[PDB]
């Protein structure tokens, strides 16, 4: 199988490298992660929470992470340039809570002790793109409030708060809802708006879960009661729409079997998202994904990084 | 988008209309081809051979042709003023052979009966710019001999024959070779030369495939032996070099997906060819093309003919 | 009146929005068609033929179209997102034939000149959802063959051809028959089947009108003889049965006077059709309709688009 | 003149003059005395004015203008006969003053045609007398102002 | 372009382009395929070139221009259809040499339009080929030179 022969055969064009973020395209960085290394990272399902993680597998510029003490059914894959992982020690130096290995107490866990117990090595610091050392996102402080789209229920724009800040990004949290709805963004995210945006746009605003008087939610009173400030309007930036076009081909990780990356096509577009189709598979497996998502890549990425590529059905 | 605003922002000019052949520039002719019409035409991969074709798609002044009985994977695009297509009945009336639809036999095929059996419409004669109702190109009669550059292997100038004449054009065939290397041209073509030109210029001439005694190749006796005359030297006209300049902009079909036409730029020039660059794409997709190629057009061609134009990426 | 109070008094539910095609449900698009605008479209009684049409009336997201030069008794209603109407100039740019206004001749007609003579405005291109600017429905090329149910005589499955392709849809034509029986559909249509389906299912296949030797009807030789390919079986997709249930309420155009839309109920169901009952009217006016028909809509459609809703009688 | 229907709203439609500004347009209904079926001029004796800047004006042909514009003429059965009004000279009424339309005045019928009346404002000069269509929205029966709560200007 | 009749001599008239060099002027008759009545461009949807140095080049209007200039349009009835010529490609004839007008040469019809022919001088480069109106006084039937006593130049 080759991309060159397949494109000639299909009279098709790949999405150029120029349409991707540098982080999605870069193939010349080596993967320094090695089996058994220990580190810290967010649970992709609960992006506000941090766990002790171990490198269980490496494949090209990707690695599979295992939650120490928990079942292997929870293992997940990230790129070696992921900002959602951090070196041993990072949580304690930056004000983040550790969920310790199964059966430990928070107060009970110490990296020194754990590494002695396991005789394991911590992943070296120099591997990690994110250590909370770079300038923060301008204008977004922890504790400030804003209006945000519930990416799980995208018809809802909701009262939300900044609850975390790491390097150039911040975490959006939906007031008094499960942290499973939280997501990381930057100032240009198309999913966030200043306080007052819904009322100015004539959209209903979804109030906090279990808000005492759900009927008459008022931002001014809520901000006062909560000792909170709005993110100032100047901080919000326009992200330009992406330049991907329908029928362009690319490589995308399989959501159902994330170990796998497949030949894919752009099936549809929005301003900030693309709809992925896996060539040769049912359109029933098609899915929408943000254009900046870390698991889409230009054609060639797998061969240049050493990751196997699944040809079309 | 708009050419006008593009030219201002880029501080650039378009290749003037006068630089193009009338046939590449003409926008004011309507496309009278309709879905399902039947006709005859050359196979672009075997330019000496004629097949039954059906109009499968129309886009502006272009059409996509299907080889009757064969796979749709062979379909190809032409312009409505293509001289490489002819009305039903042309082959018989002009001394050409028709390769029939898949599963027929040359002499099993009758247009009357085919049309009855399909209930299809033959494309009307008046649509075609080439019907062999013009007197031939002066001095180029079938069977005559000349020296020609193998456009596939441009360092070779070779023993070649005229094997087909249609309106103002004729077919150049390489003696003892596949029709695969053949090409259509006219008497001003820069790829052809009178008998003796090589000798008189210094360059070696490639004789017919598997000729007896190749270095000892003698034209005046090849000629007497084949009962052929060389094309008279007075026949070969001087096409002047084109006047395209680097950085001029135009519109060009994308060879990767020929359904598409794009904003393009002149990246380089030779006497009779231009190197095309698609604005906003990698220089890796840059390609050489004959100045007189049917698939380059002046700015505004798409707009005036009703074909989409791909703006720069 | 109000849906809300109606549902309480009847102790009933409305057919949810999710049950409908997006095209049947969408209310938030404005109707940009204006009185007197000119365009092209199919004749609903001769679905293979295109005529010049004028906007005669606008009501909410619907419009009434007039055949230029002909009687107003032929006027008909469509939705503003109809794929059966196209901008001025479309026929020429896409290989379709235009039947001209009464008293003209196909080739006497020019849009430039018609617009000058009438001083009329062509409806702007951006209004149309169907302009042949999308790539076709996969595997369905013009001239290809299939088996189809005669929607007029549903016990018959018949030899049929693709004769028209426009955006995601194509026209099914019965071999040797009037266009009167033709219908538009897409590859998930439940009325179409690959070549051989009848034989493989047990049912008899109706051959072309006035074919020689009907019981002795052979597909692979009909095919070789017509220079046609059958539509490949991989092309035919499985539309799942709709999920409408008896007693769900909705809004539906009244076929007796199509200017009107009414409160309606699901009286019965098949896999791909629903039987409509108009609340407060006799069951004698109950009628069967395809679930995907453009003239059924979710509760609130009229209200959101600005079309009157007939309350129950 | 040659004219078209360009707008329809409820029981009314807009009459437009072909090749002319909308400045001359007017709304009416099928009983309007200002409109006529195609051919009426020819059949009555009067000359018909063709579209502005038409090619070859005296040689103006309707059935071919029609075929050429993909238009039909309004059918003759459509044009209804408004009967002449029954106002008589000296009857009194209330009428908006065109000089200052905020005002309505006591008025008199000074003259009549089949479909128009000439209005005189009692106590004012006959110089301000003006012609108006009987069906104009700005003439009203005596007592209209009083019953609707609009001041009535008494005679001067 | 906007133009005027500035001369009349026998059966012909001179066409002049308003406020342009008289070098652009040409003689014709009523059937000339190069002239049209006032309004033709607008009826055909072609741009009309206004007079040189027209005070407001943007909004040229024939009605106003005619009034300002004290001028009338040539009436439409005066313009006649000239039938296309009947010359066919490859027919041979005699034509004066534009470069050396003392000379008349053997010539061929290289191409045709409705009212013009393209002349090729047999034996010379097609680079010397030229379009000429079918009625031009310097093309002639074969034999014209010998019958009038003018030398004829044979083909190159």
Curated annotation (Swiss-Prot), chains A, B, C:
Widely expressed. Expression is reduced in colorectal cancer cell line SW480 and promyelocytic leukemia cell line HL-60. It comes from the Eukaryota. Changing residue 158 to F/R: Strongly impairs binding to monomethylated and dimethylated peptides. Residues 174-181 are annotated as: Interaction with monomethylated and dimethylated peptides. One of its GO terms (biological process) is negative regulation of DNA-templated transcription. Changing residue 254 to N: Does not affect binding to monomethylated and dimethylated peptides. The record marks 153 as: Positioned at the entrance of MBT 2 and is required for recognition of monomethylated and dimethylated peptides. One of its GO terms (molecular function) is nucleosome binding. The keyword NAD does not apply. MBT repeats lie at residues 1-101, 109-208, 217-312. Ubiquitinated in a VCP/p97-dependent way following DNA damage, leading to its removal from DNA damage sites, promoting accessibility of H4K20me2 mark for DNA repair protein TP53BP1, which is then recruited to DNA damage sites. GO terms for cellular component: chromatin; chromatin lock complex; condensed chromosome; nucleoplasm; nucleus. Keywords: Chromatin regulator, Metal-binding, Nucleus, Phosphoprotein, Repeat, Repressor, Transcription, Transcription regulation, Ubl conjugation, Zinc, Zinc-finger. The record marks 150 as: Mediates recognition of monomethylated and dimethylated peptides. Changing residue 181 to L: Abolishes binding to p53/TP53 monomethylated at 'Lys-382'. The keyword DNA repair does not apply. It is found in: Nucleus. The MBT repeat 2 specifically recognizes and binds monomethylated and dimethylated proteins. In contrast, it does not bind trimethylated proteins. The MBT repeat 1 does not bind methylated peptides but inserts a proline ring in a Pro-Ser-Ser/Thr sequence context. The L3MBTL1 locus is imprinted. Paternal inherited gene is expressed, while the maternal inherited gene is silenced. Polycomb group (PcG) protein that specifically recognizes and binds mono- and dimethyllysine residues on target proteins, thereby acting as a 'reader' of a network of post-translational modifications. PcG proteins maintain the transcriptionally repressive state of genes: acts as a chromatin compaction factor by recognizing and binding mono- and dimethylated histone H1b/H1-4 at 'Lys-26' (H1bK26me1 and H1bK26me2) and histone H4 at 'Lys-20' (H4K20me1 and H4K20me2), leading to condense chromatin and repress transcription. Homodimer. Interacts with RB1/RB (when monomethylated at 'Lys-860'). Interacts with p53/TP53 (when monomethylated at 'Lys-382'). Interacts with CBX3, ETV6, KMT5A and VCP/p97. This is Lethal(3)malignant brain tumor-like protein 1. It comes from Homo sapiens (Human).
